[PDB]
Amino acid sequence: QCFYNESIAFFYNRSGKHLATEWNTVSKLVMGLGITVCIFIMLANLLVMVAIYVNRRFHFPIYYLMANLAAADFFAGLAYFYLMFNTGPNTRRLTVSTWLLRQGLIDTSLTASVANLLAIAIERHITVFRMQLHTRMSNRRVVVVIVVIWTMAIVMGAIPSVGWNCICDIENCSNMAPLYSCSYLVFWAIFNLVTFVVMVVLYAHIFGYVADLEDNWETLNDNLKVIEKADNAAQVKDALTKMRAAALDAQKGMKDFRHGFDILVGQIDDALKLANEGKVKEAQAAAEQLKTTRNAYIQKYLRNRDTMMSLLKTVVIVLGAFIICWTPGLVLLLLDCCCPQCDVLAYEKFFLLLAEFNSAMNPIIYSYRDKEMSATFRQILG
């Protein structure tokens, strides 16, 4: 059993897994649809990689990482192509080395996109707290990051092919993968799922902080209109106190522009002192100067955050579609070794195609969300 010259039939018969010898009707259609999707992945992801390369506006650290994510899908397109060519009756034709090759290329392609989306999540976590994009130094650093992403992918796709397999542990073989160990699949599934959880936490921290700044901006704009209305001294004090409390929460999270927002805190504090004396008209005039102060930075930060959030939402849709399709397949791996006889793993072909379509979904997402990229795709074709 331990590295014997045994066929794939030896491993597939021992575990509760089917192996075909004849050309089945569904095997021809799953191969037919499989190749058709693979060719589209190798064309749609190649089109967006050329689009970032020729367009001047897409020469930024965030867009270079998107091209690497497309390159990971392009590699996945080649990985699933070799898989569909060796499915059904052609599965029996595979040797011990070639089985680990098709299974290895798929494991490499997943962690290539997993580490890419992880790097994009870190990229967005820095740029939001740094307001705008970085210099040329980060573009040289991105090349180093791309190396780390692909190195991690090659290593993760080699770990089961470098001793961690049930070849010399034939009793601990999984029902889904007859050459892969159950201890590896439990580790592999919990590794990719914990990465999805920490990635959700990263964007939740971004959206939460943006919502905290937007509600503070809402409190600063609504209470400013209350002072504009001719009212008593007590009404002016209540509106200024709410603006001061919102401003202190706004300056709470290196590049720091806190010396710009603290000026407004001082202007409100000086306006609050005028209201305490009894001067209502002077307090209303001082609060009117605060309106011209916020209308000066509305073109420097409030007009640039809309372009940032438009690209941020696009990234979350790419990550969202990735979780929704890959999680049922990874949960299936957990139910394979930790759920024996509770339920049959019949929905195996469905979850495989569900994850395959995601590699084609990414250029489709950038086509209707990004305005500049949509016009660039037509320029390459013509």
Ligand X SMILES: CCCCCC/C=C\CCCCCC(=O)OC[C@@H](O)CO
Q: Which stretch binds ligand X (CB under 6 A): 66-74, 98-106, 138-146, 306-314?
A: 98-106
Number of residues engaging ligand ON3 in binding (CB under 6 A): 21
CA distance 291 to 208: 26
Min dist. Cβ of residue 340 to ligand ON3 (A)? 16
Q: Which of 100, 220, 286, 315 binds ligand X (CB under 6 A)?
A: 100
Which of 355, 360, 361, 373 touches ligand ON3 (CB under 6 A)? Answer: 355
| Alpha-carbon distances of 48 from 132, 317, 320, rounded to whole Å | 24, 17, 20
- The C-alpha atoms of residue 160 and residue 184 are separated, in whole angstroms, by 7
157 binds ligand X (CB under 6 A): yes
Q: Which of 188, 196, 322, 366 binds ligand ON3 (CB under 6 A)?
A: 188
Question: Judged by CB under 6 A, does residue 348 bind ligand ON3?
Answer: yes
Residues forming a β-bridge with 181:
173
Residue 297 class from Cβ within 10 Å (0-12 exposed, 13-18 middle, 19+ buried)? middle
33 near ligand X, rule: CB under 6 A: no
**Owner of token pair 């073989």:** 173
Name the binder of 333 from ligand X, ligand ON3, none, CB < 5-8 A by kind: ligand ON3
Rounded-to-integer distance, Cα 92 and Cα 87, Å? 9
282 binds, among ligand ON3, ligand X, none (CB under 5 to 8 A by kind): none
Shortest CB 81 distance to ligand ON3, Å: 11
Chain breaks in the chain (C to N over 2.5 A) after: 253
How far is residue 104's CA from residue 96's CA, in Å, rounded to a whole number?
A: 12
Of the candidates 221, 79, 216, 222, the one whose C-alpha atom is nearest the C-alpha of residue 157 is 79
Which of 54, 148, 154, 338 touches ligand X (CB under 6 A)?
154
Binds ligand X (CB under 6 A): choice among 161, 183, 195, 327: 161
Task: From 135, 144, 146, select the one nearest 59 (Cα to Cα).
Answer: 135
Residue 161's binding partner out of ligand X, ligand ON3, none, with CB under 5 to 8 Å set by partner kind: ligand X
How far apart, in whole angstroms, are the C-alpha atoms of residue 295 and residue 302? Answer: 10
Q: How far is the CB of 188 from ligand ON3 (least distance, A)?
A: 5
Binding to ligand X by residue 77, rule CB under 6 A? no
* Positions in the binding site for ligand ON3 (CB under 6 A): 30, 83-84, 87, 103, 106-107, 110, 176-177, 188, 326, 329-330, 332-333, 348-349, 351-352, 355
